[PDB]
Design an enzyme around this catalytic site. Structure first.
Site, mmCIF file in Angstrom:
data_model
loop_
_atom_site.group_PDB
_atom_site.id
_atom_site.type_symbol
_atom_site.label_atom_id
_atom_site.label_comp_id
_atom_site.label_asym_id
_atom_site.label_seq_id
_atom_site.Cartn_x
_atom_site.Cartn_y
_atom_site.Cartn_z
ATOM 1 N N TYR A 107 4.612 -4.360 8.698
ATOM 2 C CA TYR A 107 5.624 -4.470 9.744
ATOM 3 C C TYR A 107 7.066 -4.414 9.218
ATOM 4 O O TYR A 107 7.885 -3.679 9.764
ATOM 5 C CB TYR A 107 5.372 -5.722 10.586
ATOM 6 N N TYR A 163 -3.772 -4.673 -1.830
ATOM 7 C CA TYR A 163 -4.482 -4.028 -0.719
ATOM 8 C C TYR A 163 -3.549 -3.039 -0.002
ATOM 9 O O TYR A 163 -2.591 -3.441 0.640
ATOM 10 C CB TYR A 163 -5.033 -5.091 0.251
#
Lengths: 300, 298, 296, 297
Positions: free
Chosen positions: A112, A138
């Protein structure tokens, strides 16, 4: 410091988090964990995206991690999803997992807020310097809005000894190829695991180490076989396994994961088909698709 | 409350930091610059305000200080959304307790909810709060896009939802969001979530912009909208073209990295952010120097 | 036997003083034949098919056929976005004595999947020459769906295979898998040098290559290691070639490769409008990569 | 100046019947265009299936167009390939036939560099007297003319009269209008997408080279005419009312739907040349509903 037991090869299952009547369903969870263990799976990733980390609260996280460790009893590493888009809050979750006795943490690139590459590096560095756990980067740009460049992954591998590997969920084969090649050049024992079930075969071909898997929730033996056949030097059998699993690989993503996988596990009698808002149960069409593919795969 | 139904410019204001803390004196100067220059609303703790790294105690201080300065002149709308429906309700209630005039609620990021999920998320919150809610669509950051038909369903059903901040830059989406929402409910508000789409969103029938550029050029963004609303489309377009370099420069790195460097060049704040954000590169700072100078802002 | 396995070189069309450079060309063909290339593709994208007139085409294809002397297949680019014109081109190829034709999906007019099937069907039924479907959506604006490719495979016996230059691994994976289920012997060659290794892993048959213009032995080796069962060596050839594979596309192909062949002394660095010669930056990059590569 | 039209230029289809040009239907269509106030005709564009119309037919189609039109509005002929040498030839053919201008697509498939695009148009510009229209359509060609490149063209090649901008990105639309007109105030920018026309007009552009006008000439004319008259709300209302038809005409590749539509309206035979094929039943049924809804059927 570091925990080397996190350096697994093969299949690590991103296990769902079963709910019932709005609470954790640990009885169903235990059945699922044993199903993984009994089927040759080599690691468990708890509270990843598949485990609905966004909607599991602090007390629930502790309960789920502790129970997992009790069941597993050191047979395979337990790796805990513990990343937000705040570097400060991320450290807090990592430390909570470390305190609970987790072997490792799976730490998503901040979503985000779209940090720069230097920002990503500093994020992992801050965490790396303050924990003794093995850390797995990740990368999943489709969900986060940011992509870790292979060069940035390589810099992390060279500098941050704590970071044991990366779960590469960018489906672009150029990225998979270069992430494997650059990180391993920077540090020869850095692990690269597929974060996409349907990319696993090719990531193995690229020189990678396995998969952190959604499919293995329902078909652990088959995903394990895919990897095991490859490592055995039986490329043809690995490819056949990949081919056989294709319908299931695709069906589990016809709606946002873990919506289909929970519907499938419910069909198979493992869990209730309950998710937390903003996630909602699979459509009737998705459920029908899963029923047929599971039956065709001998899982139902 | 029609107070939140602003037209024109709502500034998505930065959160100034100094030595790792809130810099509320600098923040107050920025707020006064906004008021002095005719902005119609303030959006606090949006993406531009680094909502992800501002803690609960700081959120309280920042919102309270904003209300103290603004003193009811324009609506203060507080960013208060997460990717958990339950936690979002909690944040919205806190915002209500703080005295927010409304909340800006981003579509859940990262977990990629279905369209029915998005609807249910807003319905759950809308039914459980007394505040006006602004849907915030920004697929590039969240991984999910609210379909125009979904936004229209929200407008028709959820009376509490006052409008949408539409940061999907595709003109097709912009055109259809404005059209379908206002058909569903004539006074549903649609504000641009991209400064460089403001002009076209106005042409599409929309109501203004929730802006990054207005942190540094409030008067000019206000002029862009005012020329349009007064029936002077070509003058609006000229304002737009003149601002374009600044609009582009403010996104050469992830917002709010460039806008903080800009406000620091202009003497308003320290150029400090919180990890995972870091200060702008020299190349960015140099570009801002040039563009701010050309714009008469430095 | 247009059913080649391994490397098929998409050779450039050398020019000098605004005319065909048939002298430089023959050298290049020999350079190819000497290093075990398994096929030649003439007048492909890399051969500037758009700016080569029909007489040049004929003169170029004949000279090629005389040099090869039947050692390896000569497959000629013969496709436009008109089904009728394509046929004319394909029959011409057939008459000059081509071994097969490379037929690009109609570019620019974006035909439907049914349109693409009827396109190859019409041509396929009016020739006795092996046909290679050529999919390259980045240039044409249309992508042959793997299911459409498989329908071609099953129904059109004259269509011998597909050059798959859609770089998406999903497409590559499905194209190989579906067409070979449709017809076991249907060939799938890579149309992207940097996808060759993965396409081989996917069950494919080789590559129609740009890099091989300059480094034919290495590309052949990449494939040969794979076919012999040495996956790891093959991947290493692939990694070693990565700099060159990338350098050749820093500008629109064949702008870089011609510049490279000029550095190596094979041709004059001349293209036809709307193509222009490589930038200085491109040339300097190429000089470095070629050296590091041992080709300069 | 005759070539510098404002408003609607129809990218007219090329009718076929039993495999040949259907000039009788074509003439009916041209008359339908003129009667409804269209400001230009673009012949042998993408919509006119230029890839499959042979050299002899081109001549017959162009000559017939000029004879029917007889100078009332500019006739602009699609005359571009991906070969600079061949493009010049077609441009010269169009000029000899009496075309008022040529629409010259960026070379497709070979993906020329920005400098290459510039040299392409410079080469043509210096070698003909006709007004040239740059045609940018990256979705079909694989190449995008940068706004900066188009502005250089505007500045340098007085012979290039304007650009048909069919890149649907509003950023590109905005900057192409802005930069070209800064380079040369009277450089024309026409939309190359019907559903971008309203926004391109707001940007400061000059109208549209249209597909929808094949079936709804008067409505597309009104959209532009209302805008030019300073009737923004009315223009916006025309735009909104045309949405269904604008979308339906591209549910399959243009000109597949627009030919199905004109056939439903009784203007032409629903015949195309391979690799194009007739519209699906689904598309035909949508067009029927949308056309009746629009009062065109």
């Amino acid at each position: 410091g570091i925990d080397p037991f996190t350096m697994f090869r093969g299949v690590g299952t991103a296990i769902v988090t079963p709910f019932k009547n709005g609470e954790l369903d640990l009885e169903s969870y235990e059945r699922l964990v044993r199903y993984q263990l009994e089927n040759g799976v080599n690691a468990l990733i708890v509270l990843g995206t598949t485990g609905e980390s966004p909607t599991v609260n602090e007390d629930e996280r502790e309960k789920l991690v502790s129970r997992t460790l009790e069941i597993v009893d050191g047979k395979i590493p337990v790796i805990v999803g513990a990343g937000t888009n705040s570097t400060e809050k991320t450290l807090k979750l990592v430390k909570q997992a470390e305190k609970l006795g987790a072997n490792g943490v799976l730490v998503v690139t901040p979503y985000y807020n779209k940090p720069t590459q230097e920002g990503l590096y500093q994020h992992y560095k801050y965490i790396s310097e303050r924990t003794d756990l093995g850390i797995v980067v990740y990368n999943v740009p489709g969900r986060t809005g940011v992509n870790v460049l292979p060069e940035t992954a390589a810099r992390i591998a060279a500098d941050l000894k704590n970071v044991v590997g990366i779960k590469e969920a960018n489906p672009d084969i150029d990225q998979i190829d270069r992430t494997v090649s650059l990180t391993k050049q920077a540090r020869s024992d850095f692990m690269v695991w597929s974060g996409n079930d349907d990319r696993t075969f090719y990531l193995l071909c690229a020189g990678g180490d396995g998969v952190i898997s959604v499919v293995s929730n329902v078909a652990p033996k088959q995903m394990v076989e895919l990897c095991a056949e490859y490592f055995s030097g039986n490329l043809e059998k690995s490819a056949e396994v990949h081919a056989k699993l294709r319908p299931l690989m695709k069906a589990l993503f016809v709606e946002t994961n873990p919506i289909p996988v929970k519907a499938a596990l419910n069909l198979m009698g493992f869990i209730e088909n309950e998710l937390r808002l903003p996630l909602v149960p699979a459509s009737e069409k998705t459920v029908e698709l899963l029923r047929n593919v599971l039956k065709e795969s001998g899982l139902l």
